[PDB]
Amino acid sequence: NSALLSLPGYRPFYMGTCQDEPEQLDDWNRIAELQQ
Amino acid sequence: LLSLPGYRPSFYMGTCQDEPEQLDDWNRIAELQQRNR
Amino acid sequence: DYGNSALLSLPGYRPTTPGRNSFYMGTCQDEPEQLDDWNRIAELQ
Amino acid sequence: GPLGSMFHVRYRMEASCLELALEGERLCKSGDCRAGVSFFEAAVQVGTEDLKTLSAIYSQLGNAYFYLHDYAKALEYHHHDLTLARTIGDQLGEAKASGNLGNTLKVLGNFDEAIVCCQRHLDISRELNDKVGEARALYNLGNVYHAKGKSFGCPGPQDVGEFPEEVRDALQAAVDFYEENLSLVTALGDRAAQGRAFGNLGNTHYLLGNFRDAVIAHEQRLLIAKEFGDKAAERRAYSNLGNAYIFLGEFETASEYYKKTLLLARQLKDRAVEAQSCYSLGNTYTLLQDYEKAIDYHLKHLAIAQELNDRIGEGRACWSLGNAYTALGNHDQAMHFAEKHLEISREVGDKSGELTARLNLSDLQMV
Amino acid sequence: PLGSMFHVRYRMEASCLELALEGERLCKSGDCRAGVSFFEAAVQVGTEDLKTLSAIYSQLGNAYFYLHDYAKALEYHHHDLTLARTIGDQLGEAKASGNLGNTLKVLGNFDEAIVCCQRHLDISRELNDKVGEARALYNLGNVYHAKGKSFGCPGPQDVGEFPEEVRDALQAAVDFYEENLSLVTALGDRAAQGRAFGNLGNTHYLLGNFRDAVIAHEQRLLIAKEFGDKAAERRAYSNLGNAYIFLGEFETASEYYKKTLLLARQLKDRAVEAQSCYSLGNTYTLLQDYEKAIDYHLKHLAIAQELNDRIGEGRACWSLGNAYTALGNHDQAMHFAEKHLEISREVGDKSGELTARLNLSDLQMV
Amino acid sequence: LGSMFHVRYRMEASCLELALEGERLCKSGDCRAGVSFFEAAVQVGTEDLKTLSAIYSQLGNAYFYLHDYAKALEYHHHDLTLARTIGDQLGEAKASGNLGNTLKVLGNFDEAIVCCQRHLDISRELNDKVGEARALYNLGNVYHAKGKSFGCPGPQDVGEFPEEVRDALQAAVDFYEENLSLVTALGDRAAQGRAFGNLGNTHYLLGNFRDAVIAHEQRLLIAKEFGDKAAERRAYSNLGNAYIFLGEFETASEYYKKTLLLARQLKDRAVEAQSCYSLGNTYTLLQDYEKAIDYHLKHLAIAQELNDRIGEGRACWSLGNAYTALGNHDQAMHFAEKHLEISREVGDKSGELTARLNLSDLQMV
C-alpha cells in the first residue's frame, strides 16, 4: 500500500496561481551603519 | 600487479554477424483498447 | 567543540597587536623545474 | 595650497576591506547585485580582523547570491555566517543566520533541514525574549511548510479533497504558524507584517480548500494594502479574491474582482498582469455562459500575448477561443483557432494540447 | 448535421489512455523519439488502471531501449517489475524480469542480468508456460554469449589462450541455446529455430568449434530460405564464410562471400556490399591471388569513398599497399601508403600513422 | 640482402614503437601529440614490466608539463603501484618523488610530505647519494611552496607572520642546507647553484635578508661559471629585491640596472619591462621622482607593446603617484583616469575603487 502509490499515476477550465507575498529582502544597509 | 592497465608476461575481417534483437511490442496498448471497448 | 583557533577555516582574518618601512616592492622568481627526462625509454635491452 | 596634496598620496595606496565592502553594499542598494558580488568577494580576499564586519559581509553575500538565484553560493556564505556566529557565541547572529540558511534550503527543496534551521531560529528567539525575531521565525516556518505542501500535486487531482495526507498536514502546519505570527504581530502593532501574514494565510487556505477563510484573510490584506497605498499588494489581493470566489461558485462576484485587477493593471501599465486579468475574465464569462463577452476578453489576452511573444499563452488563448466559438456555433472561426492551437502545441512541446487539438478538428470538420 | 452537440468532451484536453495510444502509434511508425514524449506525458497524467499502467511502463522501457537510453530503460522496466510484483501478476513479473535482464545485459551488469533472466525461466516453468520458458532460455543464452564476448577484443585471429572464464560462459550459452532449440523444435516454431541456430553457430565460432558452427549456420540458411528472409540468408552466408576461413578452406570461403555479395547487390545495401568486397579481398590474399585481391579491395574503396566512410578508406589503403607490394608495384604501393598515412592522421589512428611511416621508409628504397 | 619481404612490416604498430614515437614528440616539445601516442601504447600493452614502468612515468611527466595534474596523478600512481608489487624499490622511490611533486602543485601538502619522505628513506637505505640529494631538494621545495601558499607576505614596517608559515620556511631552509652539504660533497656544481637560489629566496621570505644576499651571491658566482645568462639575471633580480628590504636603495638600483643590461642583450621585452618597473620603484624610494617617472614610462611603453593590460594599469597607478609627488596635478589626473579605465577592463575591483578616491582628491586642486 505504501509501496503501491510510489509510481506516477494512481488511486480511486484553467485557473492561475495563488500569487504569494513577495520574499522580504528589505535589507541593504547594514555595512554603512557598521561604519562606527 | 594484477590490475594495472595493459599487460601480461589481428588483421581485419569483420567478424561475427549476430542475430537481430526482436522487438514488436507496439501493439499491447491498442490491443487492450478493444479488450474493454 | 573546544577550539579557539581551529575556526581559522573561515576565509581570511586574525588579529595580532638604513631601513625601509612600508611602501610597495614586487615579487622574486625561484629556480627552474628541471626536466632532464626525455630519454628514459630510449635505452632498452 | 591644498588641504591634502600629500594626503592624496595616502589614497594612492590600495583599497581596504571595509572600502570594498561598502562599495558592494552600495551596488546592491542600487539594484546591480551582479557587480556588488564581485566587490564583496574582493573584500573576502583582503580579509579583516573585525569579526562583526566579517559576519555582515558573509550575510549580505548570501543575500546577494540568493537574489541572483545562485543558491549554491548563497548556501556557502550563509553557512559561513552561521559557523562564525556559533564559534563566537553570538546567539542573536546565530538565529538570524539560521533563518537565512533555512530560506535558502527551502528554495533548493531540502525542506527537512530547512525546518531544523528555522526551528533553531525560533528557539533562540524565544530564549532571548526577542519578540520581533520570534515573529520573523514563525513567518519563516509558515513559508517553509507552505512551500513543502506546494511541492507535488501541482498539476494533480485537487477538487474536493483528498490529495495525500502529507500535503494537508504540511498546509495545516503553515496555517498554525501564520496564525501564531499574526497573533504576535498584531500585539506588536506591525501593520506591514500583518499584511504579509494575511496574504500568505489566505493563499494557504485557498490551497487547502477553505475558501471562505481565504476570502476573509485576503479582505484583510486588501484593507491593509489600501492603508499603505501599496497598489501592487492591492492588485494581488484583488486577484486572490477573484480566484476564491470562482471556487465558491459566485462567478458574478469573481468577475468584479477580476475587473478591479484589470483597472490597476492598466494604470500600472503592466502588460503581463493585464493579460492574465483578461484571461481570468474570459474564463469567468465562460462560466457565466456569456460566450460573447468571453471571446472579447480572450481576444484582448491574445493580442497582448502576441505582443509579449508569450508563445505558451498564445496557445492557451487559441484553445479557449476555439471552444468559446464552438459554444456559439461559429464553426469556421472555431476551426481557425483549433488549427492555431495545434500549431502552437507542436511548437512548445505541449503533448497534451497537441492530441486535443487533433480530437477537436476531427469533430469540428464533421459539422 | 445530426449530432452537433459534440466537441466539449473531446475539447477538454487530457486523458491518459489517449496520450498512451498516440505514443504507441508513433512507435509503430518508427519515430520512438516522439513516442517517448507522449508516453511520459501519459505518466504525468496517471491512471487508475494498473493493467494499463503496466503496459505503459513496459513500452516506455522498450522504447528507451531502442533509443539507446539504457538508463531510463532500466527505470521503467524496474517500475513494471515492481508493479507486477505487488499485484502478484506472475506472468507480468516474468516478462518484466526478462526485459530488465536484457537491459542489464547491454549495461554490462551480467551478474544481475543472470538473476533476472533466471527468474523469468523459473516462473515460466512454474506456470507451465512453454513459450515463455523457451524465450527465457534464449535470453539466458544471449546473456552468457555477451558475457563471454566482453573479455577483451585483443583476442583476434585466433587467440589460443582462452581464459577459462570465457570458455565456461560460452559453453553455458551453448547449453541454453540447445535447450531452447529442443523446446522450440517440439513446439514447432520454425522462426525461433532459425534464431537459435544462428546464435548457436556464432557461439561455437567464438569457442573455436568451427565444424559445429558450420553445421548450425547451414541449418540457419535452410530456415532462412524457407521463410524467404533474404536478410537472414545473407547473415548465414557471411557466418559460413567466416568459419571456412578459420578451417583453412579458403576456396569454399570465397564462394560463400560471393553469395553474400550477390544478395547485397540485390538488396542494394552498399554497406554490406562493401564489407563483402573487403572479405573477398582478404580471402584472395590468403589464396595469394593478389590480382583478384586488388580488384575487390578497390571495389570496397570506391563504396567507402561514396559512403564517406573515412575509417574504411584507410583500411582499404593499407590493404592495397600490401597487395601491390606482394606483386611488386612499388609506385602504386607508395601511393596508397601515402593515402594510408593521410587518413590515419585525419581519424586519429595513432597505430596506423606509425605503420604508414615505417612502410614508406622501406618502400622508398626501390 | 633480401628486402622483397616488407608486407610483414605493413601490419604493425608495436608497444615499443608507439612509445618511442611519444618520447620523440616530447623531446621536440610537442607533448600534446606525445600523450596520444603514449596512451596508444598503453592500449596495446606489453609483457615487459620495466618498459611499462617507463611509459607510466613519462606519461605522468608529460601530463605534468601539460598542466593536466589529474592525469599526471593517475599515471605516477600506477608507476608507484607497479614498482611496489615487483619490489623495484629503486623504482618505488623515484615514483614517490614524482607523485610528491604532483601533489605539491595540487596543494595537497600533507600527502606530498609523506611521498617525498618515502623517496628520502629508500634512498638512504640503498645508499643512493644522488637520490638522497634529489629527495632533500624535493622536500625543500614542498615546504617552500607550503609556506608560500599562505603568504600575503608581511615583513611590513615591523610585521608578524603565522607560526605555521615560519615553521614551514625554516623546514625548507634545513632541507636545502642538507641538500647543499651532500651536493657540495658530490661536486655537482649545477645542483649547488639550484640549492643556493632556493635557499636565498627562502631566507628572503623569512626576513633573513643578509643570509639571502649571501646565498644569491653564490648563485651568481655559479651562474657565471656555467655562463648561464638566465640564471645570472635571476640572481641579479633577487639581489636587488633583498637590498631593497635592507634599506640600501642605491645598491639595489645597481643590481636592477644589471638585470636590465642582461634583459636588453637577451632581447627579453617582458623581463626588460619588469626591470624598468623595479627601477621606477627604487628611485621612488630614493625620492628622485623624475627618474622614477622615466623608468615607469619605459615600462608602460613595453607593456602597451606586449598588450599586457594588467601591467599597463600598474604603470598608470605608479605614474599618477609619481606625478603627484612632483605636483603635476594635470598629468596625475590623466594617468588616474587611465588607471580607472584599465581597472574596470581587467576586473581589478581594488584598483577601481582607489582610482575613484584618487580622482576625487586630485580634482580639487
Author numbering:
A (entry chain D): 1867 to 1878, 1902 to 1925
B (entry chain F): 1870 to 1878, 1901 to 1928
C (entry chain B): 1864 to 1880, 1897 to 1924
D (entry chain C): 1 to 367
E (entry chain E): 2 to 367
F (entry chain A): 3 to 367
Task: Show passages lifted from the paper.
To gain insights into the topology of the NuMALGNBD:LGNTPR hetero-hexamers, we determined their crystallographic structure at 4.3 Å resolution. Overall, the hetero-hexamers arrange in a donut-shaped architecture, with the backbone of the donut formed by the three LGNTPR protomers concatenated in a head-to-tail fashion, and a central triangular cavity reflecting the threefold symmetry of the assembly. In such an arrangement, the flexible NuMA chains thread in-between two adjacent LGN subunits, and then line in the internal groove of the TPR domain. The donut assembly is promoted primarily by the formation of a four-helix bundle containing the TPR8 and the capping helix of one LGNTPR protomer (named here LGN-1 for clarity), and the N-terminal helix preceding the TPR1 of the neighboring LGNTPR molecule (LGN-2), in a sort of molecular grip. This topology explains why deletion of residues 7–13 or 350–367 of LGNTPR impairs hexamer formation. More specifically, residues 1864–1880 of NuMA-1 start with two helical turns interrupted at Pro1874, where the chain bends in an elongated polypeptide, and packs against helices-A/B of the second TPR motif of the LGN-2 subunit, facing Leu54LGN-2 and Tyr58LGN-2. Analytical SEC experiments revealed that disrupting the NuMA1861–1880:LGNTPR interface prevents hexamer formation, confirming that hooking of NuMA1861–1880 on LGNTPR is essential for oligomerization. We conclude that NuMA has a bipartite LGN-binding domain consisting of a nanomolar affinity peptide spanning residues 1900–1928 and a disjunct upstream oligomerizing motif encompassing aa 1861–1880, which is essential for hetero-hexamer formation. The toroidal architecture of the hexamers is allowed by the characteristic TPR array of LGN featuring a long TPR4 that confers a pronounced curvature to the scaffold.
NuMA is the dynein/dynactin adaptor that in mitosis assists spindle assembly and orientation processes. In metaphase, when spindle positioning takes place, NuMA accumulates at the cortex by association with LGN. The TPR domain of LGN interacting with NuMA comprises 8 tetratricopeptide repeats (TPRs), each consisting of a couple of antiparallel helices organized in a concave super-helical array, in such a way that the first helix-A of each TPR faces the inner side of the super-helix, while the second helix-B is positioned outside. Here, we show that the dynein adaptor NuMA and membrane-localized LGN assemble in oligomers that can form multivalent interactions key to sustain effective pulling on astral MTs.
